[PDB]
C-alpha cells in the first residue's frame, strides 16, 4: 500500500511563515515527480507548484511565485513547501500529489526514471492552513430543542465561536446516525467558526430517549457533550 | 622466436553526462553518478545509477563525463595482447596518454626487445552495429606494418542494456631475419 | 495563463443514461496533454484519465476523455450509482498547470418539499449577549431554495448565513440551515420572528414562526 | 492494494443484452488467466465462462455457451462479458476472479506467467444482475401488530417492491437486539417481499415506542412507519 | 459433463472438533486437479485448497484436501469459531469446469423451542385489496421445523412462501417466517386462520391463531 | 493489506496442549522474523518466543524454554507455536508479531532479507487461551435494585458463575447507552468469573420506565434478558 | 536476565503538556537495541520508537526516544488527547528479550470523590445459597481508593472482590465495584451490612450500609 | 616459412520459438519496423518455460498464418563452425561474409580462400562455453578436420561448463583459434 | 619445427559462501538440482543481501541435512585451471585430464611432453570486476612448466573471476 502523508499544518497570521511537509512510502521515490495542490472545502482545486525527480524543473502558479518555495530531500523520502508572506486568501486545504516515473522532450524522447509533475495517481489525506489574525478559541455548544412540528419532530445543537477548524460532531457517543445532519461550519465576521448539527426524531420520544451531542475541537482540546431536552 | 599473445577490454560506452554526488564513505576517491542510460530503441532512454573513480571521469563548469567516450576499446585490447605476448605485463605499466599512443608505445616496447609484427586480430563483441577498414589501417600504421597483417571483425547480439567488448590476439617474431 | 471553464456547473442525471462534461481552454492544448480527475465528499481525487484519452487503474471503460486544441470532453456511459462525484479536468500542455472549477455529478430524483423547523434562541445563549435563531429545512430536492427572516414581518438581510449538506446517501436530498445571527438588546425589542420558505415542491411559501417568551 | 471491480450489473429485460466490465488492478493483469462465476443469493456457486492470459483458451459452461462472450484488453487491465438472449434463470450475482499466472499441458511442463483458469485466490465483489420484467418500485410497509404472556412480538411488512435490495431499521438504529430481517422473496407478481420482526418486552408496549425504518433506494422511496397494539 | 455432489449437505459441529466434507464426481477427476473454497454470507470465496492438497497463502494446517480419481475430501483437525462457513469443491480435470452445491458447517448448539407467534392482515393492507398473514418462529435450533397453515380446518397447498435467517451470531439460533398471502375475498370468506408448528424442542404441535374481528 | 491472524486459542486443561497458528498476508513472509507476545488482558506484555527468517535462530522466555515449540512454513506464510503442559499461568492472550526485514551481526554487517526478531511493527489482534479446569457453564444474573441515596439511583446486574470469557452485556435492546458501566471480570475462588453491569438513571424514571439488562454468553449460547425494577 | 522497569507506574496529564517517561535497566542494554510502544484499551501494541531514537512509520514528531546504558527515555513533546495510552519500553540487545511492567498516560482531572451506592443480595440469588453484597464507587478520581466491608461492625479480609473500569471518555474518571460473597447461612446470621470507602476527594470516609429486611 | 593466428568469437541462441506480436511505434524519429513480440522462452529445466518479450525486426520474421518466426534458428555446433569460421579468415586477413548457408559450408568456404591464399591449416583448438549439461567432441573433430581437409590430431575441441558457478538462462558460446601456414616443402 | 597453438578458459566464484539448500526437481521424464539461498555482496562496504540460485549437486559439497558449499573454495586457481586447458588444446588432449591446480598444471606439462613438445611462450589474462602479486605465480608456473619466467606472461585487465589463456608450444629440439 503506498501511501502519501502531509504533516505540519495549523495556524499562522498574515504575514506570518510556515512550512510543510510530505513523507512518502512504498515506492522508488527517486523516481516520481511531485506537486503540491490546495483546495478550499466545497470550492474547487488549484495547482500550487510541481517539481521533477530531482528538483531542477520547479515551476509554480501565477499567485505563488517568489512567494513559496518547493524542494525535497530525496535521501529520506520527503518534500517540503517553504510558504512566506501569508495572505488571508491562502487559507485552504494543502494536498500532496505524485507526478509521473517518465518524462518527454520537445523531440518526443521517453526518459524512465526522470520523473515530472504533469497528471497526479497517488494522492494524500491533506492538511490544513488557516491563515487568520483571530486567535485560537474554543467552541460555546447551545441547544436546539423542540416545540410539535406534526407528527415528526427535529432537534439540535449549536456549535459558535470556534477557531480554527475542523470540529466532529456525533450522537449519543457515535449510536445514533440516521436522519442526521451536520452542516458545513460558515466562517463569521468576527474571526471565528460556526457549525449546526441536526437530527429528525419522532415526536413522541419525549423524555424516554436521551440525546447527547458529541463535540470535540482538538486545536484547542475541548471536547463538550451536552444534552438536549425540549 | 615466436610469441602469441593475448589482451582484453570493455567499455560501457558512450559519452553520456554524469550527474555525480560525493559518493558514501563509512568505513570501521569515489563518486556516485547518475545518468541517462541508452537502450537499444533510439527515442527510449532509462535513469540509472553508477559508482565511477574521479580520475575516469572529468567535470565541466556537480557535472561530469567519462575520460574514453567513442574504437578505443579495441587499441587497449590489442595492446594488452602485444605487451603480454613480449611478457611485459598490463597496459597500466606504460606511463604517458592517447588510447592509440599507448598502442605505440606498446610496439616501441616490443621491437626494444627484438620484435616485430607477424600477424594481428581483433574480435568486436557488440549488440547492433561497419566502417572496419578504417580502424584496420590506423593500426597497421601504428604497428609499422602492411594493411594485410592487421585484421578486424565484429561479431552482434540481436530486454534491454548496452555494452562493448573485445578480444585481441597478435603474433610476434624476432626482427632481422632477412640473413 | 491558460484558465480552464468546464460546464455544466451541475449535470443531475439517474443511473444507466449518458453523461457527457466539457471543458474549454483559453487557448489551444494537445489532445494528450489533458487529464481528468474524480472527487467525492471528504475524500482526495483519484486519477480517471491522463494524456488525453487514456484511462488510470482501476478505471473501467465507462469513462472515456478526448478532444483537442480548445474543446475537451469526458463522457461517461451507463452512469452507477459509484460514479456521482464532481470532475475537474486538468491541462498540464503549458505552464502554470492548471484545474477547472469542477462539474458537479449529482442524482436526479423526484421533487421533495421540505421540513421546515424553527428553533428559538436558548437561555444559555441569551446571557452572553446574543442570540441565534436557527431555521431548518430538511429532506428536500432540488438544491435550490429561498429563505427569508422577518422579525414582526421586518425582512432582515446582511445577518443570516446558510449553509447546505451534500446530497443525503440514502434518500438523495438536501438539507438547510439558515442562521439568524442577534444581540440580546434587539432580540428582546421585537417579538415575532419567522421564517418564509419558497421551493418548486410548495404550492406556495411556507412560513414557520415562534413568539419571544414562553 | 490488489483488487478486482466489477461493474455494469442491473436491471434488463428477459431477452435482453447487458455487459459487465472487470478492473484489475495491482498486479500483472496479462500474467494471469479471468474467469466469471455466478452465485444467487444463498445458493452455491456455478461456473460461467474461463479465459487465459491472451485470450486463445475461452471456455463456456454448457447453460451460456452460445449466449455469452468473454474478451480481454491487456493493455487496460480489464476484462468483459458480453451477454446475450438472457432468460431469467440467468438473475444471480457475478463475480469476476483471478485465475493462475502459471499453466501446465498434457505433457506436464511448466509455463510460467501465462496463466490459465483453473483455480481462483482473488476474487471480485461481485455485481447484481437482475433480469425481470417488472418495474422500478417502492414497497408498501404494513404493520404487524402484537396480541402476549411477558414476551411480544411486532414487525414490519415490506411488501411489493422492485429491485432488490431495501435497508431496514428500527427506532433509527437504538433498536440493535432481538431483531430479525428474513431474506426477501419473489412473488408470482415478479416484485420482492420480505419481512421484519423484533422482540419486545410486554410491559413497554404502552411505554414504548417502536418505529421501523424502510428504505428503498431505487424509488427514492423513505417510509417510518410506526407499529402498535 | 462433470458434476460434482458433496456430503453431508450440513455439517453441525461444537468448536474445536474434527470435520470431514466429502464430495463425490460423477466422473473420475485427476487427484492433482480439484480445488476447495471457504464462503460466509455476505462475502466473496476464499480459495483454500488447490491441486489436491496443497494450501493456500495464509491457510493454515487445519485445512487438508485429498482423494484421488471419484472420491475427494476436505478435513479440518479443530474447527475454529472463524470456521463456521460453507464450504464448496471444484473439479478443474476437465471443462467446463464445476462447483459442488456446496457444504455448510454451522454450529451445533442444544435444543431450543420456537417462540411461535401470529399476525393478522394490517387494516391499511386490507384497503388495497389483499391480506397477508405472516407466521413466526423465533430462535429454534435446529433448523428442520414443519409449519402448516389451516383456515377453517382445511390445509392450503402453495399461497405460502417461507423465509429463514442465518444462524444468529449470539445464540446460534434460526427465526423462521411463513407468510399466507391472500385476496379481500378469500380473506372474507373464512373466519379463523391458525397456524402450526413441529420441531425437535416441542413436545406436541403448538398453535398460534385468531379470528377476524378482534 | 498487511496482516497477522492468530488461530488455534481456546481453553484446555492444566497439563494439556495447544497449538497457535499465525497467517500472514501482503508482505514477502519469509523476509522477515517473527515473535510470539502474550499478554493478560489488564495487565501488561510479555515476551514469549521469537525466530529468525529461516527459523535458524529461534530463542524462547525462561518461563516457557522447554515447553514451547517455535516453527514456520515460509511456503505458506504461516507460523506455529507449540505448546505442551500448560499451567494455569500460561493463561493470557497470545499475539503474533512481525520482526525485520534485515539483521546485523557482531561485526556490524548489514544483511538485507535475513530478518530477525528484535521489534516488532505488525501485531496481530490476538487469541486468548484460557488454562482451567472450568467446565463450560452460563451466569446466573441477578438484579441489582436501588433504594439508596442520590437525586439519581443506581442500577445493575450480577453476572455470576460462567465460564469461559465473555460475556457481553446491554440494556433495553441497546437503546440505554447513557451512564452504563460494565466492569471486567475477576476470576472467582471457584474458578469460575463473575461481572457485574450498573446504570444511574433519573430517580423519577424508576416508576414509570422499564430497565431490563441483556446478558450473552456465546461459548453455552446463553441470552437472558433480567427485569430490573425496586 | 536484563530487567525493565519503567516509571513512573501512573502519569496524569493535561493535554499540551510534556510527558517524560524512563526505562531503567538492570545491566548496561547497547544504545541502539531499544524500542518503545504504545497500546490502547482492546487493541494490540503499536510500536512508535525503535533502534533507540528512530521513529517508525506515522509517528508524529511529539514522540523522540533515547538513552544509553541503563537509562532510556521517551518523550512526548506535547501530550495530545490521541496519546492518552499505555507505553512499553522493549530492549533487544541480550536474550531472553523483555519489556517493562507499562506507564499509564492518563489524562488529569480535578479531583472528584465517589458516588457511593450498595446493593443487597437479590432474593433470587439468596435461594441459591449463596450471598453477594456489591458496592459501587462511581464516577471518581484520581483512581486511587480504598473499601472496606464490615458485618456487624466486624471488618472482613478475604471474602471481597474489587472491580476498576478504565478511565471513562466523556468525564474522565473511574468506576469501582467491591462485591462482598457470602454463604446463604452466614447471611442470615448477621445483620448489619456497611461498605466504608476512603478516598483523597471525601474529607472523611464515606459509609453506607443497610439492615437485612 | 609464413604462420598466422586467429581467433573467433560466437553466440548463436533463441531456438526457435513461434512469435505473438504487434506492431510498435517507434519512427526514426529511413524507418524500419520491428514489433515487441511475445514467446515461450526457455530455462534451465527442461520441462519448464518462461514467458519473455523482446524487440523483432519484421524483415528478419516470416508470418505463419498475428504470428511471426525469426529467419534462422538453432545448435551448439553451429556456433563452434561460425567461431572457428572468423578465426581462420582472421589469420589470412578476410573478415566475414555471408543468410545462413551450411555452417559446415561457410567453413569449407573460408577455408578454400585461405587455401588459395597459399595457407593450410597448422592446428586449430576450440573451446565451448556453456551451461549444460564429451558426448560427441570426436564427432566434430572428424567432420572438422574433413573440411579443413587436415587430421584429427589438427583438431581439438573442449567443453568449460559456467554451473559451479551458480546459475539462474540461455545461450550457448564457443571461442576458437587457428594457426595457418604456408604449404611448400623443400624435398 | 612444429607449433602448435592453444586457447584455455575457466570461471570461478570470487569467494567461499555457504548455501542454504531445499530439495527442488529435476522433473523425471544421475542428475540432481537444488534451488539455494545465500548472502549475496552489494556495492556497499559490509551490506549483504539474500538471493537464491540453483546449483548441481555435482559442484556443491554438503557439510555434516540441508546446507553446502562450492568445492572451489580458496587466487590462481582459475588462472592455472585455463592454462592446462590451453597447454592441453594446443596437443589435442581434452578437458580435463579433482583438487589441487599446480599438481594438474605439472601433470598437462608431461602428457604434451610425452608428444615432444615445450612451451614457446604462454599468456594469461585475469578478469575481474574489482581489482595482487602475480609475479609470484608467473614464477611458479615457470617452475611447473620447466621454462624461462621470461616465456610466462601474467595480466589483470578490470572494468572500470574469470580467465583467459593462449599457449604456444615448440617442438622438442633442435639441431643447428
Ligand atoms: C534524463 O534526461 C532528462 C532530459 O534532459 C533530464 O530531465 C531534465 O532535467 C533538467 C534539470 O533538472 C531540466 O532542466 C530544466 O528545464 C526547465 C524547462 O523550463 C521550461 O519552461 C521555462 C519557463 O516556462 C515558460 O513560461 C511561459 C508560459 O507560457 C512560456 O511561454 C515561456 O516561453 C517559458 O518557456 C523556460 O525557461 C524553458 O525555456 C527554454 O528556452 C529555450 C527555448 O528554445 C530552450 O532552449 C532552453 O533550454 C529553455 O529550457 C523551458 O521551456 C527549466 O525550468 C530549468 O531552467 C532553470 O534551471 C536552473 C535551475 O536548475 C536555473 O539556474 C535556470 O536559470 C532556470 O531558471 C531547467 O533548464 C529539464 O527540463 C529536464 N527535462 C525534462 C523533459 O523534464 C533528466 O534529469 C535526465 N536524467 C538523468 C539521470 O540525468
Ligand atoms: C507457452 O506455451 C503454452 C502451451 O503451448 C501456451 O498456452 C497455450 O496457448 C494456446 C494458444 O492460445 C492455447 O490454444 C487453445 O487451446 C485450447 C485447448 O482446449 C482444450 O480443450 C478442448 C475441448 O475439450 C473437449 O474434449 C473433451 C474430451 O477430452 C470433452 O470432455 C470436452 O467437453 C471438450 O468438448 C480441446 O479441443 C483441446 O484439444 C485440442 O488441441 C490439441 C492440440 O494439441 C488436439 O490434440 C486436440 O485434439 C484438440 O484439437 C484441449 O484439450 C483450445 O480449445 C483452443 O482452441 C482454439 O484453437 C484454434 C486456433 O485458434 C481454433 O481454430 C479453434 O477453433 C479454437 O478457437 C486453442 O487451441 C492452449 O490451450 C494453451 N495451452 C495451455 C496448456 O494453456 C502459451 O500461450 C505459451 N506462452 C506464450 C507467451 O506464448
Ligand atoms: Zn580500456
Ligand atoms: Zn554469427
Ligand atoms: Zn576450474
Known amino acids: 500500500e503506498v501511501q502519501l502523508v502531509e504533516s505540519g499544518g495549523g495556524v499562522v497570521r498574515p504575514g506570518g511563515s510556515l512550512r510543510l511537509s510530505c513523507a512518502a512510502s512504498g515506492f522508488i521515490f527517486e523516481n516520481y515527480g511531485l506537486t503540491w495542490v490546495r483546495q478550499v472545502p466545497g470550492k474547487g482545486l488549484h495547482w500550487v507548484s510541481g517539481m521533477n525527480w530531482n528538483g531542477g524543473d520547479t515551476r509554480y502558479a501565477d499567485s505563488v511565485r517568489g512567494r513559496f518555495s518547493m524542494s525535497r530531500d530525496n535521501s529520506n523520502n520527503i518534500a517540503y513547501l517553504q510558504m512566506k508572506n501569508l495572505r488571508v486568501d491562502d487559507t485552504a486545504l494543502y494536498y500532496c500529489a505524485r507526478g509521473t516515473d517518465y518524462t518527454i522532450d520537445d523531440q518526443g524522447i521517453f526518459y524512465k526514471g526522470s520523473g515530472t509533475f504533469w497528471y497526479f495517481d497517488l494522492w494524500g489525506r491533506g492538511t490544513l492552513v488557516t491563515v487568520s489574525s483571530a486567535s485560537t478559541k474554543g467552541p460555546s455548544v447551545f441547544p436546539l430543542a423542540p416545540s410539535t412540528s406534526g407528527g415528526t419532530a427535529a432537534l439540535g445543537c449549536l456549535v459558535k465561536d470556534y477557531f480554527p477548524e475542523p470540529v466532529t460532531v456525533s450522537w449519543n457517543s457515535g449510536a445514533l446516525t440516521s436522519g442526521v445532519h451536520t452542516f458545513p461550519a460558515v466562517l463569521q465576521s468576527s474571526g471565528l467558526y460556526s457549525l449546526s448539527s441536526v437530527v429528525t426524531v419522532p415526536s413522541s420520544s419525549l423524555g424516554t430517549q436521551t440525546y447527547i451531542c458529541n463535540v470535540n475541537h482538538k486545536p484547542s482540546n475541548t471536547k463538550v457533550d451536552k444534552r438536549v431536552e425540549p | 622466436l615466436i610469441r602469441i599473445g593475448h589482451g582484453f577490454d570493455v567499455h560501457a560506452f558512450g559519452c553520456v553526462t554524469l550527474n555525480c554526488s560525493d559518493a558514501k564513505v563509512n568505513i570501521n576517491e569515489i563518486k556516485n553518478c547518475s545518468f541517462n542510460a541508452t537502450t537499444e530503441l533510439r527515442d527510449k532512454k532509462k535513469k540509472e545509477y553508477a559508482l565511477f573513480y574521479r580520475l575516469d571521469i572529468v567535470p565541466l563548469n556537480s557535472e561530469y563525463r567519462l575520460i574514453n567516450c567513442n574504437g578505443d576499446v579495441a587499441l587497449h585490447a590489442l595492446t594488452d595482447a602485444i605487451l603480454g605476448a613480449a611478457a611485459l605485463g598490463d597496459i597500466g605499466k606504460l606511463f604517458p596518454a592517447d588510447s592509440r599512443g599507448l598502442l605505440r608505445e606498446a610496439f616501441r616496447q616490443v621491437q626494444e626487445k627484438g620484435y616485430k609484427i607477424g600477424n594481428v586480430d581483433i574480435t568486436i563483441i557488440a549488440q547492433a552495429p561497419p566502417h572496419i577498414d578504417a580502424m584496420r589501417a590506423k593500426i597497421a600504421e601504428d604497428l609499422q606494418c602492411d594493411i594485410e597483417q592487421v585484421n578486424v571483425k565484429a561479431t552482434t547480439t540481436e530486454g534491454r542494456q548496452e555494452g562493448i567488448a573485445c578480444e585481441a590476439v597478435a603474433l610476434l617474431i624476432r626482427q632481422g631475419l632477412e640473413v | ?214
Chains 1, 6 share one sequence.
Open chain 3, 1 to 214: 495563463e491558460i484558465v480552464l471553464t468546464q460546464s455544466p456547473a451541475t449535470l443531475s442525471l439517474s443511473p444507466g443514461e449518458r453523461a457527457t462534461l466539457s471543458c474549454r481552454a483559453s487557448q489551444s492544448v494537445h489532445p494528450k496533454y489533458f487529464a481528468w480527475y474524480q472527487q467525492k465528499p471528504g475524500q482526495s481525487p483519484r486519477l480517471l484519465i491522463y494524456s488525453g484519452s487514456t484511462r488510470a487503474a482501476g478505471i473501467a471503460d465507462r469513462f472515456s476523455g478526448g478532444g483537442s486544441g480548445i474543446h475537451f470532453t469526458l463522457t461517461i456511459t451507463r452512469v452507477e450509482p459509484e460514479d456521482f462525484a464532481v470532475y475537474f479536468c486538468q491541462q498540464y500542455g503549458g505552464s502554470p498547470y492548471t484545474f477547472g472549477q469542477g462539474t458537479k455529478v449529482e442524482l436526479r430524483r423526484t421533487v421533495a418539499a421540505p421540513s421546515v423547523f424553527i428553533f428559538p434562541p436558548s437561555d444559555e445563549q441569551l446571557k452572553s449577549g446574543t442570540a441565534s435563531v436557527v431555521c431548518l429545512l430538511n429532506n428536500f430536492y432540488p438544491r435550490e431554495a429561498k429563505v427569508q427572516w422577518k422579525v414582526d414581518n421586518a425582512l432582515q438581510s446582511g445577518n443570516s448565513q446558510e449553509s447546505v449538506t451534500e446530497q443525503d446517501s440514502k434518500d438523495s436530498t438536501y438539507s438547510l440551515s439558515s442562521t439568524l445571527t442577534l444581540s440580546k438588546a434587539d432580540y428582546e425589542k421585537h417579538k415575532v420572528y419567522a421564517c418564509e420558505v419558497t421551493h418548486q415542491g410548495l404550492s406556495s411559501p411556507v412560513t414557520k414562526s415562534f413568539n419571544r417568551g414562553e
